[PDB]
Design a protein around this ligand. Structure first.
Ligand code: MG
Ligand code: MG
Ligand code: MG
Ligand code: MG
Ligand code: MG
Ligand code: MG
Lengths: 89, 256, 59, 180, 226, 251, 207, 213, 90
RNA sequence: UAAAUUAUGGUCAAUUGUUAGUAUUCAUAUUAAUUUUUUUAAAUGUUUUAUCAUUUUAUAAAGGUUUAUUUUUGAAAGAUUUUUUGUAUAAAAUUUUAGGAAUAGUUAAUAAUAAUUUAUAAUUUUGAUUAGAUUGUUUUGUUAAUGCUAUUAGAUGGGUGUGGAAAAAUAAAAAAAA
């Protein structure tokens, strides 16, 4: 959740929530610091995201065109076989 | 309440309008089934279309099957004229006189200089093409429109000896337009649509008559049956309306 | 906070304010008659301080 | 966007949301319990199969003695084992190309495997979270920063295309005499 | 979408932000646009204990028996005035006091002048509705010595957070037209002695030492004994 | 959010969720809000390079018949003050309206007067803006405005004809955003100028023995704040910039 | 926590309205005749009436007609001042008024005082001109107010206006006007035409 | 843009060809009304519902699908909104603008549009009812507006319709016009129930091209 | 952080060693590379059949040809006189 | 219309009732179940927010359906400085009652038509519609075996129509913007 501490700006109202998120400057500075640290984490995280993306794309190229090699040979063979069976026919 | 909540005929997306427009910016309203109304309903027919350079020049001569005397066709077209004129007599200038009724097998432009070489050569090739063909019994029922509803004609049904016509025509098409270069308003590798032209609006007429023949006249005769006719006679005709009272005839061939 | 919202019949405890619908929600059906017309001359009698300051105005 | 919210199992955004890699298993006695690594949507239905993109694997959270390998006087190998099956082609596809999310427990797992760095939630409570000030960081950065082109090319090789053509395979692939 | 925080990085839901983009996330709800807002609850919230022991009247109580000592009326007016400034001063409360309804003056909100934040509003014109303390207020925004090209409705003009400073040099009569103040890079040649830039696009402030002390005394690096 | 493909949901005839079509009312201040920042750009163009129909010698004259197929959209400048015939005169004295001409009057010619002229039949409009004195821009010799006596007798007027209650499109100002350079700063080095010898180059940066004076020490703000403007997606001032760069917001 | 999905779409951003669930069910016949009865209870109409389809608030014209048919108090105006105060409430308190008072109208209003009652009235008008309407005064404003507090023989209110003039918003008080209340100058003003000191009892030294 | 002049120029060069045989209509298919999907989609006439790899000969367009824009006052619950409705005809290439008015009048199905006389105009300039589309360079892409009689009076409170929110609707006008059709007094199924957009939808300022805050 | 880490990472020798998990994607395609033990057209299990037989995809297809020359009579002594064991050639 | 070998290959089908003249799957058997036993579930307060408001949070209530249930990205995923595209709602198969008759806001064409448009209309004995029973097309048990015998549960109309999508009124065991 978004943490609401007790020294956030208290809203005096009976018609609604008792505490408005508004920060003591200290809280803002703090939050900034913590969030810098997690930025450090997510940098490497998304770095790995796109790294694996190109890894997967490259493997797809190589294996898929190996596949197209073998497959085309197959369907060329079948087609030859057919036109032969039709000459025989 | 008396049918589908959203009638199926009313579900229409217009893809010739930009994407996102109809969702947010504005809605576009149109009667969309005038356009979707098909080629059977409107009575249009797709004739071999001219290349622009050929489209520029007037046609001079045409091939025709001459209708014999005592036709089912001529009779029934006369009956149709009677009915049409009793309904609306504004048709009177549109209609073609029953004297000029003929089957149009193709249209062509001959230049006036090379005139005799072309008529002799054509006539000869024509006689060779039709040498083996015996007379043709063809069936006429139904009406159709050329040139945006300006030309109103009787269709030739492919139910009969029509098949033979198609080969026959496609041969002269490949001689007259293929061999000696002549302007056939279409491609010589394409077949012409044979027809009997009944009503027509010429350029001069168009001002007083209007830009299209109202479909309200011929709607009821649209599928009417005009009957069968056997045809022994092929003509190559130049179009002059005062020489003999029938289209002036430059050449002839007898099918027998 | 939560105690305040609790008085509402919100089914999911969602921090929204949903009122109720009483059988009598309007004055006329609660038996209350038209608001009584004010007697005008009675409220236009000058107040005490005004009379006292008229007394010290004549002095 | 439900009028009366389903209160117990809320989420973020509409359902089905972006696919998230979860660990889930039916609850039972602790002695038999296994987990499933599963790529699925954010909003689950009653049976987890309805939204299930892929099945990544089984993970058994019971340290086991290795009776498959011969009893080995090597110290480290006779620590107990923890067994997990990862499907890593599907993992790299989903995570990399499809841009998944991750719950924390699967993250710890895949960290152990060497597919991901250790998670955000794994805390040695020995060390604190670090401090920062921009001028010191700047001094360190001015101290060490590599060349622009070196860096650009590294980003090229990591993110964009890896496999490249040395001049040799060019020369070997270009047509010879009769059509040259 | 148009402008994400840290590019897309999804490793936590919180990693994105509290809003994915400045732009409204559904097109059917435009007001979801990212603004700079203000604590309306606290800043309206006027003090009702100022109105203790006062004896206010109402507008439509005109009755002879109803109203009171002129002395009581005066302390009533003063109590009411103190009740309206009891939080801060609204623009329209500041503007009615200044010459020409304060056209040309620079209205800064408290938090706009503290920290590396520097911003104010030059007043172009004002519409007082029948009620003062409310209305519409238009002007030019000046942020870090960079100014708007055209005037704009001043947002949160009604919320009582505003200060200004009256200068005769800036006053404009209703006849003439309030000029936009020059953006310091373009119209006026940049000068260091006249104006120095607080903060610039890649800058941010050094750590104030008391915050550092406090955060370490929180995380338990520096000890704190009862 | 992107715009969706097509509307198959609701009947077209009824049109359902549609952004309202914005229409410019000439009675309000809002009119000038739209028209003003265009005028300035327009004049700017006229100060640099020529545009053909901008400058007329005399008031255009058309028949009643062809009135509305000729006039609307027309914008032309005249030397004197003469108000178009068969046009009821409205003075614009309301300050809110006058307000939007601020930038145009300060950094271009001073605005002397503004006039809303409405045809007797009420279906046509003329916005008439009278400028006083010379441009606060430099004016080129080959430029259009150089053919005018009111610039470079010091008053001159802009005339803009438009239909009332139309979208702020068909007042045609957007054709004018052609951009030509002001050649005033380089006029110094042309072979025509005799001050070109008073010029001296700086090729090399001068040796510097002192660093820039350090900024005053940072005071952390004392009041309550709305939280990270990063995470709230608020651009740096709530003004301009990208949400990724948080510069100049408090901390 | 928004009411978006709880109530009909047109009710969005609905505030201050009493028990909004009412206007959800008003279509139903019994709720509708309930409302006929309610409108009749509010009065001001010839006919049985009901507010239009989806409206939660009452129509502007209707509440305006309710406001103008509502009989003002003070049916007995005697002093010119009371007349002018009734006209004042007519002009400037009119339902959804664009117009706003002028310091000249307040001077005019303040010159009609005789009895202390009228002082209270004029002073509450002034109260509305400062606090409610936010209107800057002129120099002569304190002149007017001062001579007005003299006319009724109550000088308490004048010095009470001096000791704090900032809340009441008198932005200029000539120093002699201060002295007159502090007791320094026997007289507050001299009438040039009269060449005598005001008030007259202090002018007893001038004689 | 670029397309328009690329294809225009292409057509114009195609017409100047001395040698062309003409197309073979067995090789130049029409379009299908029969294709997968429930919806019926109308496309460009150069385009087909199947895959045609080959570029067909440029044809002159004998039916030009004009779009003509109107202003409607749409009732939404809060009050009136002024929005835009396009009417789309197919107008023959050589047609006269009078005839375009006539085709437009027949094609509109909404009761609120054509009540009085309207004038066609492009970027605010009226068109001659006398002359051809050819002269004015009207194409599908061209933006054509339409202007009613009372439209220049709409800045007043009279001609602009009166919403029952702020205005009396009386037994005078309960029996007349859109008010009558609307059934102001709520019924159980709520009558024709119009689209509603709330008051705070755009904020305190209504919709605009320019950002006002 | 990234920089310090790259530094102490490149400094250790146990790295610069290929990691099968980190480095590549073995197979990106959704279908397998070769047929493994799945039921046949007759419904018979993988264990009941070996691939490559009659169910498999078909292989397809004056003077003298180049295959005429390689052939040689067993009567004539061959190319290089490889000492075949008589029993084996039998 | 000829045999075959370079020899067990291409990975296990295998059936168990002590009856009573004879004809016919029928009592007493094994396996599987109900009879039969508290070693796996669980308690209420969902949550932020700019304050009487506005953002986030979309399929377990019942009714009994056999020619039946069908769909997008505009939400999120999601990465750029702004206008961005096209593809979808449709169908085909499989459908129960021992003794069997008619069904109906109704078909198709027209079209953003028609509570009275036009027509020689549509469903049915190749089993309809009503009516009974019943939660539909990878799940079980028995068995050597073509069989026989199970499979829950979950989509119940509209009426200011919000939302990307109605799936929107207790009944989680889905971490829901530090
Ligand atoms: Mg998106
Ligand atoms: Mg249910
Ligand atoms: Mg049933
Ligand atoms: Mg079916
Ligand atoms: Mg179906
Ligand atoms: Mg209901």
């Amino acid at each position: 959740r978004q943490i609401r501490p007790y020294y956030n700006l208290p809203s005096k109202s009976e018609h609604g929530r008792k505490m408005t998120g508004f920060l003591t400057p200290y809280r803002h500075w703090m939050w900034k610091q913590n969030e810098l640290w997690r930025n450090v984490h997510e940098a490497q995280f998304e770095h790995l995201r796109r790294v694996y993306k190109r890894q997967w794309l490259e493997s797809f190229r190589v294996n898929a065109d190996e596949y197209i090699y073998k497959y085309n040979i197959t369907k060329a063979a079948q087609l030859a076989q057919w036109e032969c069976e039709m000459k025989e026919q | 309440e008396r049918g589908l909540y959203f009638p199926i005929n009313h579900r229409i997306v217009d893809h010739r309008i930009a994407p996102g427009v109809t969702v947010e910016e504005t809605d576009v309203q149109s009667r969309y089934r005038r356009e979707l109304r098909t080629n059977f309903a409107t009575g249009e027919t797709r004739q071999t279309i001219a290349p622009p350079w050929s489209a520029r020049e007037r046609p001079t001569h045409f091939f025709s099957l001459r209708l014999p005397s005592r036709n089912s066709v001529t009779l029934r077209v006369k009956e149709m004229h009677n009915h049409l004129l009793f309904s609306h007599q504004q048709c009177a200038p549109m209609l073609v006189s029953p004297t000029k009724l003929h089957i149009t097998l193709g249209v062509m432009t001959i230049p006036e200089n090379s005139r005799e070489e072309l008529v002799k050569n054509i006539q000869q090739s024509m006689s060779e093409t039709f040498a083996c063909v015996q007379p043709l019994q063809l069936r006429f029922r139904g009406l159709g429109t050329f040139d945006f509803g300006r030309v109103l004609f009787i269709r030739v049904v492919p139910e009969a000896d029509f098949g033979r016509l198609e080969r026959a025509v496609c041969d002269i098409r490949r001689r007259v337009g293929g061999v000696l270069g002549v302007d056939l308003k279409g491609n010589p590798h394409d077949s012409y649509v044979p027809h009997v032209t009944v009503a027509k609006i010429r350029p001069n007429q168009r001002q007083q008559l209007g830009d299209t023949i109202p479909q309200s006249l011929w709607a009821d005769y649209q599928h009417h049956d005009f009957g069968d006719v056997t045809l022994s006679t092929v003509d190559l005709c130049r179009m002059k309306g005062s020489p003999d009272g029938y289209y002036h005839t430059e050449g002839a061939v007898h099918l027998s | 906070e939560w105690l305040y919202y609790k008085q509402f019949k919100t089914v999911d405890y969602s921090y929204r304010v949903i009122p109720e619908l009483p059988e009598k929600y309007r004055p006329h059906q609660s038996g209350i008659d038209q608001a009584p017309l004010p007697d005008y001359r009675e409220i236009n009698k000058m107040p005490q301080w005004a009379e006292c300051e008229e007394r010290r105005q004549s002095k | 966007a439900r009028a009366v919210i389903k209160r117990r199992s809320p989420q973020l955004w509409g359902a089905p949301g972006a696919p998230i890699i979860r660990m889930r298993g039916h609850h039972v006695v602790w002695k038999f319990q296994s987990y499933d690594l599963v790529v699925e949507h954010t909003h689950k239905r009653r049976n987890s199969d309805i939204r299930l993109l892929h099945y990544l694997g089984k993970h058994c959270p019971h340290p086991q003695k290795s009776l498959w390998s011969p009893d080995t006087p090597v110290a480290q190998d006779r620590h107990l084992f923890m067994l997990t099956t990862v499907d890593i082609d599907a993992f790299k596809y989903w995570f990399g190309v499809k841009r998944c999310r991750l719950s924390m427990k699967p993250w710890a797992l895949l960290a152990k495997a060497g597919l991901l760095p250790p998670s955000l939630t794994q805390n040695s409570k020995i060390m604190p979270k670090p401090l920062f000030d921009k001028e010191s960081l700047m001094r360190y950065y001015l101290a060490n920063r590599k060349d622009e082109d070196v860096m650009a090319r590294e980003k090229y090789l990591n993110y964009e295309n890896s496999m490249v053509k040395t001049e040799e395979e060019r020369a070997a692939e270009r047509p010879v005499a009769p059509y040259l | 979408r148009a402008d994400p925080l840290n590019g897309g990085s999804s490793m936590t839901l919180g990693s994105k932000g509290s809003k994915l983009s400045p732009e409204p996330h559904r097109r059917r709800m435009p007001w979801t646009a990212a603004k700079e807002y203000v604590p309306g609850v606290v800043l309206n919230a006027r003090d009702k204990m100022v109105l203790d022991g006062v004896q206010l009247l109402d507008i439509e109580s005109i009755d002879r028996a109803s109203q009171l000592d002129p002395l009581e009326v005066l302390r009533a007016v003063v109590a009411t005035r103190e009740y309206n400034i009891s939080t801060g001063k609204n623009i329209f409360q500041l503007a009615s006091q200044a010459t020409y309804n304060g056209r040309g003056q620079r209205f800064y909100r408290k938090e706009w002048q503290e920290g590396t934040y520097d911003k104010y509003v030059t007043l172009s014109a004002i519409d007082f509705d029948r009620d003062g303390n409310k209305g519409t207020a238009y002007g030019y925004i000046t942020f870090h010595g960079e100014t708007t090209t055209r005037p704009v409705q001043v947002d949160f003009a009604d919320v009582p957070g505003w200060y200004m400073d009256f200068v005769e040099e800036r006053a404009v009569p209703f006849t003439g037209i309030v000029p936009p103040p020059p953006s310091i890079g373009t119209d006026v040649p940049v000068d260091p002695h006249s104006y120095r830039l607080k903060a610039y696009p890649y800058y941010d402030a050094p750590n104030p030492p008391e915050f550092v002390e406090r955060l370490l005394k929180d995380r338990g690096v520096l000890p704190d004994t009862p | 959010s992107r715009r969706f493909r097509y509307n198959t949901k609701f009947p077209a005839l009824v049109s359902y969720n549609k952004l309202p079509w914005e229409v410019v009312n000439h009675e309000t201040p809002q009119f000038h809000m739209h028209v003003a920042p265009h005028y300035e750009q327009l004049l700017t163009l006229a100060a640099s390079s020529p545009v053909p129909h901008i400058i007329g010698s005399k008031h255009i004259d058309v028949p009643r018949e062809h009135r509305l197929r000729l006039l609307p959209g027309m914008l032309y400048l005249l030397d004197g003050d003469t108000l178009p015939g068969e046009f009821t005169i409205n003075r614009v004295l309301d300050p809110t309206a006058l307000q939007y001409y601020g930038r145009l009057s300060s950094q271009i010619v001073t605005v002397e007067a503004v006039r809303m002229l409405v045809p007797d039949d009420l279906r046509l409009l003329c916005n008439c803006i009278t400028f006083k004195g010379p441009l606060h821009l430099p004016v080129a010799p080959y430029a259009s405005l150089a053919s005018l006596r009111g610039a470079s007798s010091n008053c001159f007027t802009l005339y803009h004809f438009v239909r009332p209650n139309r979208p702020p499109k068909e007042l045609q100002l957007e054709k004018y955003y052609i951009h030509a350079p002001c050649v005033a700063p380089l006029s110094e080095f042309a072979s025509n100028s005799d001050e070109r010898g008073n010029w001296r180059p700086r090729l090399q940066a001068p040796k510097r023995t002192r660093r820039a004076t350090p900024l005053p020490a940072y005071r952390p703000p004392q009041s309550y704040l709305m939280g990270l403007a990063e995470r709230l997606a608020v651009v740096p001032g709530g003004c301009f910039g990208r949400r990724s760069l948080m510069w100049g917001h408090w901390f | 926590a928004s009411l978006r999905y709880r109530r009909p779409y047109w009710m969005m951003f609905l505030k201050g309205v009493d028990n909004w669930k009412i206007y959800t069910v008003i279509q139903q016949p019994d709720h509708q005749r309930t409302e006929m009865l309610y409108q009749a209870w509010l009065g001001g109409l010839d006919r049985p009436y009901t507010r239009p389809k989806c409206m939660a608030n009452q129509p502007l014209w209707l509440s305006k007609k309710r406001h103008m048919l509502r009989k003002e108090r003070l049916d007995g105006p005697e002093t010119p001042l009371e007349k002018y105060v009734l006209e004042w409430h007519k002009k400037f308190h009119s339902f959804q008024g664009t117009e706003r008072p002028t310091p000249d109208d307040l001077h005019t209003a303040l010159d009609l005082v005789e009895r202390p009652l009228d002082l209270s009235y004029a002073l509450q008008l002034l109260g509305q001109c400062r606090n409610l309407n936010n209107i800057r005064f002129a120099k002569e404003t304190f002149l007017v107010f001062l001579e007005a507090c003299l006319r009724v023989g109550r000088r308490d209110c004048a010095e009470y206006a001096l000791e704090h003039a900032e809340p009441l918003g008198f932005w200029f008080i000539d120093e002699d006007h201060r002295r007159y209340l502090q007791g320094e100058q026997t007289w507050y003003k001299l009438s040039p035409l009269d060449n005598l000191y005001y008030p007259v009892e202090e002018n007893a030294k001038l004689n | 843009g670029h397309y328009q002049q690329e294809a225009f120029e292409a057509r114009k060069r195609f017409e100047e060809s001395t040698t062309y045989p003409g197309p073979i209509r067995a090789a130049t298919p029409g379009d299908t009304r029969f294709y997968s999907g429930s919806l019926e989609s109308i496309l460009h006439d150069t385009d087909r519902h199947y895959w045609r790899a080959v570029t067909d000969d440029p044809r002159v367009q004998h039916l030009i699908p004009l779009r003509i824009r109107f202003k409607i006052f749409t009732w939404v619950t809060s009050g009136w909104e002024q929005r835009m409705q396009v009417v789309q005809i197919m107008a023959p290439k050589d047609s006269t603008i009078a005839q375009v008015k006539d085709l437009v009048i027949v094609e509109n199905q909404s009761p609120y549009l054509c009540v009085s006389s309207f004038h066609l105009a492009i970027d605010g300039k009226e068109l001659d009812p006398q002359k051809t589309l050819g002269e004015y360079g009207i194409t599908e892409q061209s933006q054509i507006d339409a202007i009613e009689q009372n439209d220049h009076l709409l800045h007043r409170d009279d001609e602009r319709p009166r919403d029952w929110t702020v205005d009396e609707i009386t037994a005078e006008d309960v029996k007349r016009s859109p008010y009558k059709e609307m059934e102001m007094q709520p019924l159980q199924n709520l009558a024709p129930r119009y689209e509603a957009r709330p008051k705070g939808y755009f904020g305190r300022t209504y919709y605009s091209g320019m950002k006002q805050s | 952080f990234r920089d310090v880490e790259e530094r102490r990472h490149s400094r250790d020798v146990v790295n610069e060693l290929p990691n099968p998990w980190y480095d590549y994607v073995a197979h990106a395609l959704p279908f397998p590379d070769r047929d493994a033990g799945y039921p046949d057209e007759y419904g018979d299990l993988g264990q009941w059949r070996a691939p490559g037989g009659p169910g498999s995809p078909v292989r397809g297809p004056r003077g003298y040809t180049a295959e005429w020359r390689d052939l040689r009579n067993p009567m004539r002594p061959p190319e290089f006189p490889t000492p075949w064991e008589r029993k084996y050639r039998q």
